[model samples]
Target chain A: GPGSKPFTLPILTIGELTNSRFPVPIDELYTSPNESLVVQPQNGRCALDGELQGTTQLLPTAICSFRGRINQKVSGENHVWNMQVTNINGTPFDPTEDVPAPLGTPDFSGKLFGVLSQRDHDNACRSHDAVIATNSAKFTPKLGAIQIGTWEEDDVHINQPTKFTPVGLFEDGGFNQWTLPNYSGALTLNMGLAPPVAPTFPGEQILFFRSHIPLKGGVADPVIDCLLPQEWIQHLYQESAPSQSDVALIRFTNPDTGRVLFEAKLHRSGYITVANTGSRPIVVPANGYFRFDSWVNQFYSLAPM
Target chain B: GPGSKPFTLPILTIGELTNSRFPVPIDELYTSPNESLVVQPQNGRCALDGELQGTTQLLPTAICSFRGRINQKVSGENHVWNMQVTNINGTPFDPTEDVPAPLGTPDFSGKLFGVLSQRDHDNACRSHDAVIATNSAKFTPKLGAIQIGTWEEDDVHINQPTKFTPVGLFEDGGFNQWTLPNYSGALTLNMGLAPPVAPTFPGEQILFFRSHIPLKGGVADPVIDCLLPQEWIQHLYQESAPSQSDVALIRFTNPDTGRVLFEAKLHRSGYITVANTGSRPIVVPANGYFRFDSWVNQFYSLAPM
Candidate 1:
């Protein structure tokens, strides 16, 4: 609350993480973790039957506060250095418990993804935002740890493991820019393995992600109001709009499968004012980010709506 | 009743056919041509409110169908040949008409695409299923007659002029491996060029695309039944399944934007059968085509579903 409400984030200090104690039957470290007292959705309204915004609503819906950081990005070109996730749907994930399994299988761990991105930054033991390059042909693995695990278990399980098995390829293009995913569009089905011999899915779900906005009365809703830099909206219309004046596109995607589930565009708007094209219900998480590197310029918008 | 079924397509076999003369006001070549006079849709029931099978159903509707030309092949590095397109939809573009606007602005020509594999019998020319390609970067325009445009405008407009400015770029990915698109999922709508330019939103709406299908006389539809190779469906499971043993993924993407608007995967299956995952409303012209260079054995379904 100091300095103009300076967008605050948990900043790490110099000290050994100290989850130094231990737990037996360690195979279930992250498999067994604590739960965020108040659950939330990531991309859009997880409370909704389908948890989708594209087709469910005519206009874009509230952003649930998380993007699918499912795709590996930290070690890629864009280094998401800040690993401290301050809140999960306004409530907080206790640094002291093992992540609990899906509200399906009851597994637990301190904080689920924190172990992935944070440790990637910590254990990476490299410069912050360092440019990490990779060739998809080979399996690239990174290791780290979950700092806190509540309950009887002290340091929890202690086995250094690989957390990612990223894709180095697409039809003709490679994941050359901003490879690490900070925020995502859709929830993943896999929960990654902290230690694995081969590639593994993160076992994530749409339900796990919900809106985390801290309402005026401390009470929160799944539909959190988000910011859509009017600039970004305008730009999306400029270069990408199928037609320069009247046409524009709105879409929702299944990030895991790279599919477009719903799409609608402004084919013609009297060819004036770039048709004022826009979409609603854009969703993302705390540190959600996007890339416009391919754009004609750099500073288009804060992030994609 | 002529010889056999006629395998109709307005086969062109004229002698030294030349367009030595010029029309006074020459713009309607692609525009003012005969309607499929009866008018109609292709690949499925075009008459429906949303000829779109992709978003119409929730239970992975019948693959109206065609989608995955899996990731393109990889051999001696990341080389992308060409995937040329000779036709627009299932039918041919008759030049003598108003060049139907929803066709998204008549501006094409050149070796539309360069097929990547020699296996689909690589090179194609005069006939359908031909092998034509250029590169992903440059605009290698190839002009050809609509082949079947009947009515007025013989030899239509001469000296083919350029009419397109398709987006070769999107924020996320590139059309690398024989990445040229032959068909699209939803209508993008610039409605420009005359047909009419200045981003003329096609004045017409869904009414633009219909079916001349002879419902009673047994004449099939242009957007008729499409075949889905079960093996291709299975491969999608293998390469990108949601959960191993049972679940799989289904996605929708912009062949041009590389943007994934929608996606979902089977989460739990009884571990016995590979959960069958699918999508629908995969749109394409009559001679629908696909690419699968990166497939396990270099053979995969063409357009994905």
Candidate 2:
């Protein structure tokens, strides 16, 4: 009975959205406390929330850092700090070892390491009120200063509490953890890719197509020249899967008319297998920019009149 | 150079959210004008912004109504009215036909049916400043009272500009028109299904599973009772695709272990073909509720932790 009743749909106004730049100041973000931390394992070694969750090679030199803040537990009063990794340069620091500690402690150098015990108010200094364990860096402190601060250029706009509505594959298969926060209603879709671990096809070119008739639209011609890639492309890839030596091929086409625009392939050995398959010349656009470590692609935003 | 730099991730905070109930008043809403109107076809008939875009199916005795408002154009003086269908009863009305009409118009009976011509300041009554043409009702006014006002039970929360991030099937293929506004971090993923048009299998049961461990974990046991479905399910299905006689079968299982929760088949005739298969007894949950016109199913939220 209620199904047949006439109903009105709300007219939605999505404000002018812009992709956030990297190195965003800390106070401008929020974090999920309970969700398990995700990190890219280095040399078959990984850590989750400051604990050794990976293989046996406990690093003689390691530095695990969290750049985000977790939300206050439902029944709790204070926010907890989340640390993905905690052993710094031969100094083995257990996240569990540092319980209710302060921000600028003795030897920690303005960094708080531990699991849920690092309460926000207890550990926070003047500038930042909360800290999140976004990513982990596995490197010798000898390379450079161990940097710690706010949002990464590639991090999702957690500060804005952006709502995510899963569609298609993300909606099916009970796969709900995937998120895209800097989505500004663009005609492009991309994901982070690192070679070997995140491989690519030799002659693989992503084709963004529309229908013919109900279903009668083709790809934009000289597509690359016309469309503008959003900044989120680089940001998301880096935050989610920071990597080196990553490459991709983007093509806009109408599968309906069998009309393809261009071709590409990865032929270098890096993160994953690399191959150059197409006989066509590789023409990277003048404005063509590649932020390696992330795979990016675009398509025509189609609608039936 | 900046690509290799290590960064920390911020924790996030997603406040506890619940779906808003139906018949939300007009005060809490927003509208976008440029997006073309989308409405179900009733007898080879459709209307876009109060204009006839369908075959010669204009009813001799018709009532065209819009329940939403249009956003202020980029460089416009005021918010304009968006009317999907205008003609009422035998009285012919054009969205373009009305220049700068006021609310409670002469013989229009509280309904505004015009393109961006009806200004918010000029047409809005005491309660509503903007009106959106979400869905159009093509009916004989004599069938019931010509009701006009705020959001229907199926409307989206235009009041709260929900952010949508396309993923998977919705991500690739340049199909960016898809959206999921009421996503609250859940494992169950579903979409609205209407049949014949939105057909089903004789024994179609959606199976939600997880990895074998890493690569290891299996599906949850005694699945149905343990899982709790959210309210947004009904709200989403109603707003996106309101239908009747729609049915669905939900099953949670581990395909890796070949352990199925159950089996089901839709064999009958309605929106799509109807067939009944499977010798297994049809055991509907005591709490198992069916809101027809919408198809729903779920999978276990899987992770490596």
Candidate 3:
């Protein structure tokens, strides 16, 4: 492997994203077609107790790995994936039926996102199914395959029907699984894509994005490592009081209604705090994307501890 | 005068800004102390009968000129002016009570903005009053004095307090005149400070900002000349259908509630259309400043006709 040219890999993608704000359909439970596998909480940790969970160690969320091809078709179509969830918590699960549905509902709803790919899976004729969703109005949709990351052994197998974080307008209200544009509920959300830092090793760059699933509110503050540019930070100081220097704005929006439920002031050093600033109870999604009213330039990635 | 040094003048600022939405308070009138002058419709055109008017020739709005100073005080306070309305519709109006108050209501409500300034009148002890209000979340509030624009003859005279487009949090609910932070009505608004083009002549550049006054709903589309960077235009295309090449987005927001009443699609060659896309009727401000949910980098000015 030493003499080979430098390479890249796609980031793992999830399917059927949602928060506790809306009712979760049973169809959103399956991790793969044929109803063979499903995603649930690791062990008994972070059980569904009518609340939202953080993507942290103490209140950790779930993200699964997949190896598959997306059905090339028009964007936003609910094309079936010719793939399977290879890993749930660093270990792939045997196809099962007994996992309770609540473990796969709401905050733990992500099933499979994009597959880990060694080469680009882009095909113009069918249109790549996997794609990134951003809170930025200025972000141009990139291919669903993440630029670089680790991958499992079987992902190198040829595949079809790639899965993507569905965005934009969708036809059937049911097909819009990831974006949940029809779900009318309150949720806390946050999103940031930091420019890449030096990779721990070649082709080992980390890439992550929050689903537009509209996090559930009424829980502990949701914190994420994100970059806050200097210029906008100055603006935060000017708009609020001097005592609020440690505070930054984090808004929760209802995806279906486009209503901003709350404009919470979160603490930001390197990690930003996202919480429910409104009266209603909401569960923050394990990972959620927040749209801003204007265009944004800078992005954030994992802020090292 | 051949050997004189070149200098810049302040842009005109307006007071008591509002679209045709909320009821205009009579206290929002009065061109100056003693109530000598009152702003009214010119040539009896674009009258108010409960509808919003465009800031155009066919549906022109009103702006009055004053040569005076704003009282130095904490922000958002209703400070009285030691000035007089120098010009209305390019000609100074004679002091008279016969002029009706409707002309000074709604879209025609702009009484005065900042006085034409020469040198920076920044005084930390008194806290210079003149400041600029921008829609950019990243916009740092500058001295209310617009950086460069034409000025009337008498503005050079010595002055006391400087007037600013009051922003930031305020005290009493009544004192927030220009920003109407408590008004619950809807309105059409647009705001962009184009980087100055080469001036017609030195010290004659144009500077403008729309008030935070919620625009009135149910009216003809409001339009303003602003910039649309190439990067964002591409993203707009990606988000919408291909047929919407000529269409651009314009949102109307309620200042007090922070509710985005409508997200109207407008034509964008140079000027952007700001119309109410919702069911309720809203008036577009004669000149309005629209805030984007995120920070904006580029700005626009008068796109040449």
In the order shown, the candidates' DockQ scores are: 0.01, 0.03, 0.01
RMSD of every candidate to native, in Å, equals 29.1, 22.6, 26.4
Model 1, range A1-305, lDDT digits (tens) per residue? 33221111111110100010110000000111112332221111111111121101111111111111223322442323212222211122233323211111101111111112112212321000011122221111111111121122221112221111110011112221112121211242223211111101132111111111111111112122111221122122222323223222333344445554333221121100111122223333212222211211111221222
When sorted by lDDT, best at the front, the candidate numbers are: 3, 2, 1
Q: Which stretches of candidate 2 lie over 4 Å from their true place?
A: A1-252, A266-305, B1-70, B73-252, B266-305
Q: Sum up the clashes in candidate 3.
A: 57
Candidate 3: where is the Cα deviation over 4 Å? A1-305, B1-109, B112-124, B128-165, B168-244, B248-264, B270-305
TM-score of 1: 0.18
- Candidate 3, A160-248: lDDT as tens digits: 32222111111112222323110111242222111122212221221211222211112121211112211122122222222223333
lDDT of 3 at A32: 14
Task: Show where candidate 1 strays beyond 4 Å.
Answer: A1-39, A46-305, B1-46, B49-305
| True-structure lDDT of candidate 1 | 0.18
Listed in order, each prediction's TM-score against the native is 0.18, 0.23, 0.18
Candidate 2 shows a clash count of 57
Best by lDDT: 3
Q: Candidate 1: deviation at residue B24, Å?
A: 38
User: Candidate 1 residues B234-299, lDDT tens each?
Assistant: 223222322222222333344455554333222121100111122122233222212211211112
lDDT of 1 at A58: 10
